[PDB]
Amino acid sequence: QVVKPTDERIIDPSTANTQLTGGVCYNTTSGGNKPLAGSPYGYEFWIDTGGGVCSFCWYGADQGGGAAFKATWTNPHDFLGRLGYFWNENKPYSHYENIYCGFNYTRSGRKTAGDYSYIGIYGWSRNPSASNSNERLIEYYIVEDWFGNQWQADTSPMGINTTGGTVMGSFTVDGSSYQIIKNTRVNQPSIEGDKTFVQYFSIRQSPRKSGTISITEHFKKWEKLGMKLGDNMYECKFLIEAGAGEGFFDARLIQFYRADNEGNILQITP
């Protein structure tokens, strides 16, 4: 049985709404994961073949829960900015115990991030022993929010017409139903070069800009639906992805922590 941690070092996301200052900003691609000094986290700045003018600023180890960042973009071609745990040490998700993320941010409004966009938790995992060769590499998303577009409101959850693929199931956690979707990307770019791989999505049905994500609950449910993650988790990071547009994301809080089933903290920042 999993008990929610109540440790005093956990910041209440609801009222973590003071603007942060004093970022250190990066304006070009990071060439994969790059560590942050004085921090357990790594960041990544990624864009597709370019348009440019994005910035990604970390708010440092001693404020905003330690993983807070701000991003801006101006007509990017699929900008991804992310910060959080980097692993890639041949361990399954369950090796990291119960993972949580407390967040609070502001962002630009509807239709400032193109036709598609994602905010939430993101990473990859490898499962080389999967019988289906398409499932040996996994890209995953827990989507708390997005920017909508001309056709659909940012207050309405994205669906398979944005993600592609198939609704596999659903469950309720952290105050909302999530729709679970599996998609196959066919000869597309990945962390292992151009190939076929699968994407797993949990789409929050009631989008939000602050709260707590019970990350491991999503991993457990995907696996219950036959969406296996395998034995080499790559990373687990908070993401802003903007397909295009011109806008910003500005976190007052991003706090990862890990706890055992009894709720004792194994890892937390700051």
Continuous H helices in 12-78 = none
Q: Which two tokens stand for residue 41?
A: 């986290």
141 burial (CB, 10 Å; 0-12 / 13-18 / 19+) is: buried
Label the pairing between strands 195-204 and 137-145.
parallel
- CA distances to 72, 154, 171, 180 from 111, rounded to whole Å, are 14, 8, 28, 24
Q: Rounded to whole angstroms, how far apart are CA atoms 47 and 116? A: 14
**Structure tokens, 83:** 């910060």
How long, in residues, is the chain? 270
**How do beta strands 166-173 and 235-242 pair?**
unpaired
Taking the C-alpha atoms of residue 237 and residue 189, their distance in angstroms, rounded to an integer, is 19
The catalytic position among 44, 135, 139, 144 is 139
Would you tell me how many other CB atoms lie within 10 Å of the CB of residue 200?
25
Tell me which residue of 87, 225, 200, 202 sits closest to 135, measured CA to CA: 200
Q: Which helix (H) or strand (E) holds 161?
A: helix 160-163
From 228, 209, 270, select the one nearest 125 (Cα to Cα).
Answer: 228
Pairing type for strands 79-86 and 137-145 reads unpaired
Tokens of 100: 């949580």
DSSP one-letter code for 193: B
Structure token digits, residue 250: 């500005």
Both structure tokens of 6: 């109540």
From CA 89, how far away is CA 234, in angstroms rounded? 8
Which technique was the structure solved with, according to the deposited record? X-ray
Q: Where are the beta strands (DSSP E) in 146-175?
A: 166-173
The residues facing 86 across adjacent strands are 235
Residue 112: its H or E element: none
Nearest Cα neighbor of 171 from 102, 223, 242 is: 223
Residue 235 annotated among the catalytic residues of the structure: no
CA distances in angstroms from 47 to 56, 93, 139, 198, 241, listed in the order given: 12, 27, 16, 20, 10
- DSSP conformation class of 221: H
Beta carbons within 10 angstroms of residue 69's beta carbon:
27
- Catalytic residue list contains 139: yes
Spot the catalytic one: 144, 217, 235, 241.
Answer: 241
